[PDB]
Ligand binder design. Sequence first.
Ligand code: 402
Ligand code: SF4
Ligand code: SF4
Ligand code: SF4
Ligand code: SF4
Ligand code: SF4
Ligand code: SF4
Ligand code: SF4
Ligand code: SF4
Ligand code: SF4
Ligand code: SF4
Ligand code: SF4
Ligand code: SF4
Ligand code: SF4
Ligand code: SF4
Ligand code: SF4
Lengths: 183, 183, 448, 174
Amino acid sequence: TQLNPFVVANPAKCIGCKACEVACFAVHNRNNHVGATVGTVSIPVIPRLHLIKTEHGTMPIQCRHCEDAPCANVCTVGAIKREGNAIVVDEKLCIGCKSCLLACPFGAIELLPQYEDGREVFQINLKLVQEPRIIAYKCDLCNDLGEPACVKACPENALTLVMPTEMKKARNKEAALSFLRVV
Amino acid sequence: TQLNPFVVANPAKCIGCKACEVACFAVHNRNNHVGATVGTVSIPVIPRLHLIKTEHGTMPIQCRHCEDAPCANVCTVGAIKREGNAIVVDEKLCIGCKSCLLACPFGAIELLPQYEDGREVFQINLKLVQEPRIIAYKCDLCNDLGEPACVKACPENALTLVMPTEMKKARNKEAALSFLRVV
Amino acid sequence: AIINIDQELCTGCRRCAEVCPVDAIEGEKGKPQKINTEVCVMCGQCVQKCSSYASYFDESITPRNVKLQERGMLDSVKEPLFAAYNLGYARQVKEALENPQLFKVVQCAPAIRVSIAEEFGLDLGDLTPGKLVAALRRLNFDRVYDTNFGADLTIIEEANELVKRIKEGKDLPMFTSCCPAWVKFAEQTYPELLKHISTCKSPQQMTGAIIKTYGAKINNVDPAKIFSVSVMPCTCKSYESDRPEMRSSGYKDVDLVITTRELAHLMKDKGIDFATLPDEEFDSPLGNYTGAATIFGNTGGVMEAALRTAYELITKKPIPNIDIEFVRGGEGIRTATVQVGELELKIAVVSGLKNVIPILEDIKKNKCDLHFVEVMTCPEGCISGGGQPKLLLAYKKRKEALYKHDAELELRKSHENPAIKKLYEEFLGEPLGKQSHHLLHTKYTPRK
Amino acid sequence: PNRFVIADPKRCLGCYTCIAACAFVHEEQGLQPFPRLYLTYTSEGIMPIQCRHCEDAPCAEVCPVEAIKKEGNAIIIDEKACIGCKTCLLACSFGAIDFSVQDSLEQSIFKDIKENLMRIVAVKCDLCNFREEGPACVQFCPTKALKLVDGDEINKMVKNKRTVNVESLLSVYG
Ligand code: 402
Ligand code: SF4
Ligand code: SF4
Ligand code: SF4
Ligand code: SF4
Ligand code: SF4
Ligand code: SF4
Ligand code: SF4
Ligand code: SF4
Ligand code: SF4
Ligand code: SF4
Ligand code: SF4
Ligand code: SF4
Ligand code: SF4
Ligand code: SF4
Ligand code: SF4
């Protein structure tokens, strides 16, 4: 087994240009007939990472892919699984029980209507109109597709994919070199 | 007065072998000279649960033994009565008034000829030939005999006799343990 | 088309693919199946694990009147119809019986006396020989014989073959040809070992060869109008009864065979009850047999009967070997060692056809040399073949009844039959004496 | 989306007050007198469990008579059309539906009260939409364990947690 990688932001170089959410929305909605051109988008925009600003800077945050994930444990249906190297949500077994919103401390999950084949999905038996179906949304590290799309769309390269094992080795080597050069 | 049990299927572990109906037919018709051997069966076969197959697999369906049963209420003659824990039809007083087929939404009641002592049972004055007596067949949960025979005959062990009180407690405890380990 | 699967009833439950010893059925987890009839070994055990029984209360299928014509069954049975159906032979037997010109003779296998009684609402495994022979005589049958005569004949032949082959060892790990399905499988997958199998015919074919030549002289009838029907508890004998190399005197040794279910259907069509029938006896000239020929139904009975006379032929003095307990079982591979005539025998028997493939291999047989191995394709011998009726889903009751019938007779060794002595004195002379090699043996040379 | 009620097990004494209030309010209204909020004992902690109002329900998709429907911002049972087909009891993950039967009551103080005081149908938390006050369970609790969450309180909590995380990461180490 290997530790799940998670994408992180560098706030000192981020501007808030919102060019990272758009790329993620475009890359996850290829089945909704988008052709990398505004005008073919007949779907409301839903990204996966969310940008916020405070007095001391702006950055986006996303799913950290916790190993002992609370969101997976809370869900009784079992829609949230670790399919690959990352932890992903399943849009087929989700029922909308918002308890997973009460588990994630980082708040990377949002409950929003599902969109497929360019049209809103509708539940079978609800009220006289038909209620929409609501599914969770969170970062899934683009495991089915290629490299992460939040990276390679940021002009300042503030977004970085980190490996939590090699980074510890690099920190250990730097600390040892700093200590040994003084003694 | 307490909740009545009812057998339920399991679509994940059902194949469509029809080996659960034959056991029911053989255990109910002990008065029509059956000896657990094909060849002693001199009557047409009538099961109580019905197997249905569609695109998303196959499963058997039967009577769910409703408490406020529509079939018992619409029966003007009074054939259907809650004699035991389960709901049972009475073969003496049934006249074939087909209102039952308009009451049950599942469709676990079917009208078929009666067979007693290995021969077809005829009526008194009808048509010039005679006509057979038609009775409503539905699951009676093997109340007169011992434990259910559709279970203990399923090779894949798909059918289960569920009591709706213990299952609620089990689900409640599962939900409580799942939520209390995260807060 | 002998073992067929109807495509209007099969739901692809795949339960019949878990007992097939050849895997001759091809399909998916859904959709109707199909039987590869060019590789099928005709064990008949894909019939007793089928439970799709589609009723005739709906008109979406055939109206259950032409179905009985296709299956070959009688038109007055009205039993439930399954998917994997055996082919029927009852109509031809009935039409031949209606003819008052042909001299009719019927043969009874040593599992009909314990299996047919379950067809009339009686206890499982009840031994009724007298009622059975009375019913067969009441079926307008001129002669009724027991195939146990051929059983004792083939036991004597196999013992003589073993004594001949143990001297000047040539294909010492021989196998018996009691089971036609095993011979078919050996033709199928191992054509290089067609010489290992012993040249003894089945007891049914033994009696069939005896009737058409010797049986025509004990009576005043010519050997051309005789009509022989054998009641075997298996779907296994139909293929053996029509091979071009399985006849003598120009005519077929047996005309056609019927399973136990077909005989029960004929008795039901005749409208005769079974409990009222009295007790009768078989025809003495060709119906006398000993206890050792009774236990062919259960596994290990052929080997026990063969040993009961091979021991005497080897040591030439009587030692009590009636009771043996190390060769009894119902599953797997059974083995034993016997020290007789200053020679050790590593004898074994196999249950099922898939279990014999390990020790059949040319390298695995080179370590123990497997002096004597018999075969039963259906598990627990022929008493679980395709001829036995379904059980609506046990086997031990029939074999216990057969053992009790074996123990209740006054003759145990398969040599004290006066009929065998008379036959050797009058017709055959000595065994393997240029007369047995014509009527009592055959050569297995498909090499396909 | 939908409004529901949650009880953190930190401040729940198991005092059976919310359960009895939920039963008696529904009794005096004219509905079934049985409680719709179940107290469960576990190996580590005691928490009441009720119907977290699922936005897809898994309940109205199994009802054959179409009794369960979404009204206002809640899931309503519509008891009049319910027949007793125990199908929604199979499809509820948390087990929030019980049936109006005397034997469904566990032995406790509430049973003693209801036996010293004195149809079978499926009863579910209807969020007390018929009462001008809030839910009775959240209002009668001695320690205020239960709390009602709206459509906007979820957004406020999410924004608060997100802002706290971002500010902490900024302040401590980038
Ligand atoms: N021929 C022959 Fe045999 C005899 O006698 C049967 O008829 Fe058998 C049975 N029952 C079958 O099929 S074959 C194999 N040897 C044991 S028994
Ligand atoms: S909303 Fe979906 S992901 Fe969240 S707990 Fe419910 S089923 Fe699981
Ligand atoms: S959704 Fe939140 S709690 Fe779940 S793994 Fe991602 S960061 Fe962790
Ligand atoms: S890794 Fe993929 S899913 Fe995650 S924020 Fe970046 S683009 Fe979106
Ligand atoms: S694309 Fe890069 S710079 Fe622009 S908002 Fe996203 S993280 Fe910040
Ligand atoms: S068909 Fe029989 S059971 Fe049904 S309502 Fe009529 S009388 Fe009653
Ligand atoms: S027959 Fe139908 S309506 Fe009557 S009790 Fe059974 S499931 Fe309910
Ligand atoms: S419970 Fe008994 S009566 Fe009902 S379907 Fe099963 S075997 Fe038949
Ligand atoms: S016996 Fe079991 S597997 Fe076979 S059809 Fe019945 S329920 Fe399905
Ligand atoms: S008869 Fe035997 S070998 Fe042939 S298909 Fe059936 S199970 Fe397989
Ligand atoms: S057992 Fe019968 S129904 Fe099942 S796959 Fe075989 S032939 Fe078809
Ligand atoms: S054991 Fe008997 S019935 Fe079975 S295949 Fe062999 S000879 Fe035929
Ligand atoms: S009122 Fe509060 S403290 Fe009392 S049982 Fe209910 S949740 Fe627990
Ligand atoms: S018990 Fe009532 S609410 Fe549940 S499925 Fe049946 S009718 Fe619908
Ligand atoms: S009864 Fe259970 S499954 Fe149905 S809406 Fe309420 S919590 Fe969800
Ligand atoms: S909201 Fe009302 S009905 Fe629901 S549990 Fe609380 S008191 Fe009972």
